[PDB]
Amino acid sequence: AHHTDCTFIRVSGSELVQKFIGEGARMVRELFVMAREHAPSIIFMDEIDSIGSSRLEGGSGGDSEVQRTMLELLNQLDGFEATKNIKVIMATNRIDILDSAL
């Protein structure tokens, strides 16, 4: 972030969780749209363990909403629309817990 000469949007672990359903996905979409507008840009997602954990089934146990935010992020980083000049750095301990899609 110091020697970057480039937009360095930061995202913490729980900033994309949100309470109201669909707020996480909307926030991720706005973040990526803003990064593309300010392109080039680097998105740092510290503690990606929060959102991006191994996917759990439905039912009361599953978190679901964080799953939707993670799916939105997955499509954004690699989906129908390919990002141009947007590099994502995610730092997270326990590499083995992150789902095998992120």
Partner: protein, 398 residues
């Protein structure tokens, strides 16, 4: 009618390699582009009645013109229009408005002062839906997929062939499959086959994430789904691609949460639009999920998703095809025997058979070489295959 609003795309250049034939092709395309630009720039400038009627209509209309909802039609020159703030106004319908389109629920255009109806808003599509429409078709065509032939054939028969050659289906008497689900491990070619279909297809292509269909407000989700499918129907031949379906298609279960029950309601609206009362029309739905066991059985039942196309991890021939596809641009050396990496144990996917290529290129850059070598590829494989931790049993079985 409002026929397909197909995405625009420039023709494809075959040489790829920077040969003068590619230069000629690009020069010809640029010449035609400058041709169109000059023609349309001269038209208005070179240009020197209806003006009176337009001026009269615009002077009667005035600005700004409010957009309101028509609640009822009382007479042929009177209607009840409810402004955006919820207040109903008994406004007068002016002559210059086709009474045929004036139906309850339509978005009427009203004078700001007298509120007299002056026009009917046709599109009035939800802005969160008009974004989904694919205008610039992705450049990834079918030649950009290694293998996945059976899958390509199935997807073509579902979404591509029916438009181009409907004779076969009409004569056979079978309605072409109008729903396909793409499921398989991550990085197999699901979104790719979708991008290729969108590129080749001539029908309007709508892209969704399975997370944008969910809205914070209670009734915004089902209404957004209804608006999306109505827009798809408006353009008769359409393909709707709901990637990450497993975001909202999770198995319905008794949830003590409005969030979950709202998501379930969105899924129910989706499955009601897909196959329920009233026909779906000529809209084809393509869905992708790296998890099909967690989808509601109703959503993936025959009738809604008619072809559960499977996308397995690439085999030897498919892996060799994805190495040929992702290394064609690269300037490979003479000793690069890709078969060594192609062998693998069982778990090399396209993403890797591409990140491997990118890593080989970067390692060639490290040694200041633009031509990769076998050592570079082996190092890139060793560096980029570190995905799974164990995923294996012990030395029990013989």
């Amino acid at each position: 009618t409002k026929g397909p609003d197909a995405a625009s795309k420039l023709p494809l250049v075959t040489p790829h390699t920077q040969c003068r034939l590619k230069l000629l092709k690009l020069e010809r395309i640029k010449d035609y582009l400058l041709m169109e630009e000059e023609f349309i720039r001269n038209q208005e400038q070179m240009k020197p009645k209806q003006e009176e009627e337009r001026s009269k209509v615009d002077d009667l209309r005035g600005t700004p013109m409010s957009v309101g909802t028509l609640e009822e039609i009382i007479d042929d020159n009177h209607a009840i229009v409810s402004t955006s703030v919820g207040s109903e106004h008994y406004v007068s319908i002016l002559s210059f408005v086709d009474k045929d389109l004036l139906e309850p629920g339509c978005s009427v255009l009203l004078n700001h002062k007298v509120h007299a109806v002056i026009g009917v808003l046709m599109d009035d599509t939800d802005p969160l839906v008009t974004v989904m429409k694919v205008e610039k078709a992705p450049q990834e065509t079918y030649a950009d997929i290694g293998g996945l032939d059976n899958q390509i054939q199935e997807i073509k028969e579902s979404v591509e062939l029916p438009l181009t050659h409907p004779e076969y289906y009409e004569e056979m008497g079978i309605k072409p499959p109008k729903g396909v689900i793409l499921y398989g491990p991550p990085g197999t070619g699901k979104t790719l086959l979708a991008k290729a279909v969108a590129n080749q297809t001539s029908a309007t292509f709508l892209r969704v994430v399975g997370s944008e269909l969910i809205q914070k407000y209670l009734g915004d989700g089902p209404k957004l789904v209804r608006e999306l499918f109505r827009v798809a129907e408006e353009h008769a031949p359409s393909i709707v691609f709901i990637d990450e379906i497993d975001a909202i298609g999770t198995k319905r279960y008794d949830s003590n949460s409005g969030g979950e029950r709202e998501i379930q309601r969105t899924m129910l609206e989706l499955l009601n639009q897909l196959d329920g009362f009233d026909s779906r029309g000529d809209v084809k739905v393509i869905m992708a999920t790296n998890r099909i066991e967690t989808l509601d059985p109703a959503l993936i039942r025959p009738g809604r998703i008619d072809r559960k196309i499977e996308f397995p991890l690439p085999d030897e021939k498919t892996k060799k095809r994805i190495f040929q596809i992702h290394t064609s641009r690269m300037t490979l050396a003479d000793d690069v025997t890709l078969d060594d990496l192609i062998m693998a144990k069982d778990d090399l996917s396209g993403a890797d058979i591409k990140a491997i290529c990118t890593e080989a290129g970067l390692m060639a850059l490290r040694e200041r070489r633009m031509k990769v070598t076998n050592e570079d590829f082996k190092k890139s494989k060793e560096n980029v295959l570190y995905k799974k931790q164990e995923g294996t049993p012990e030395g029990l079985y013989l």
